[PDB]
Curated annotation (Swiss-Prot):
The chaperone domain provides a folding template for proper folding of the beta-propeller (BP) domains of LRP5/6. It is found in: Endoplasmic reticulum. The gene is Mesd. Residues 59-86 are annotated as: Escort domain. Its main location: endoplasmic reticulum. Monomer. Interacts with LRP5; the interaction prevents LRP5 from forming aggregates and chaperones LRP6 to the plasma membrane. Interacts with LRP6; the interaction prevents LRP6 from forming aggregates and chaperones LRP6 to the plasma membrane. Interacts with LRP4; the interaction promotes glycosylation of LRP4 and its cell-surface expression. This is LRP chaperone MESD. Keywords: Chaperone, Endoplasmic reticulum, Glycoprotein, Signal, Wnt signaling pathway. Chaperone specifically assisting the folding of beta-propeller/EGF modules within the family of low-density lipoprotein receptors (LDLRs). Acts as a modulator of the Wnt pathway through chaperoning the coreceptors of the canonical Wnt pathway, LRP5 and LRP6, to the plasma membrane. Essential for specification of embryonic polarity and mesoderm induction. Plays an essential role in neuromuscular junction (NMJ) formation by promoting cell-surface expression of LRP4. May regulate phagocytosis of apoptotic retinal pigment epithelium (RPE) cells. It comes from the Eukaryota. Belongs to the MESD family. GO terms for cellular component: endoplasmic reticulum; plasma membrane. It comes from Mus musculus (Mouse). Disruption phenotype: Disruption of embryonic polarity and mesoderm differentiation, likely resulting from a primary defect in Wnt signaling. The lineage of its organism: Eukaryota, Metazoa, Chordata, Craniata, Vertebrata.
Length: 86
């Protein structure tokens, strides 16, 4: 049907075939940066190199996607069925 609310899921992949711990360290600093920019996001680790970012307000998904892909350890960002880069 038609979605309720503004929440939005963002699926992120970490580069370099990292261990789960390294992925936790890498993504924790990303979450910190987002928070420091007033963004409200929850983080879920779902694999040695996979992370879920749950946005409270999905209307800011583009800004967050841009920030993430600009990181050296970000391989891909999946947003509404679309992978970035490119």
């Amino acid at each position: 049907m038609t979605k309720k609310g503004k929440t939005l899921m963002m699926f992120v992949t970490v580069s370099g075939n990292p261990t789960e711990k390294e992925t936790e360290e890498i993504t924790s600093l990303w979450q910190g940066s987002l928070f420091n920019a007033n963004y409200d996001v929850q983080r879920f680790i779902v694999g040695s190199d996979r992370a879920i970012f749950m946005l409270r307000d999905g209307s800011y998904a583009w800004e967050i996607k841009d920030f993430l892909v600009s990181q050296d350890r970000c391989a891909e960002v999946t947003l509404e069925g679309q992978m970035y880069p490119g």
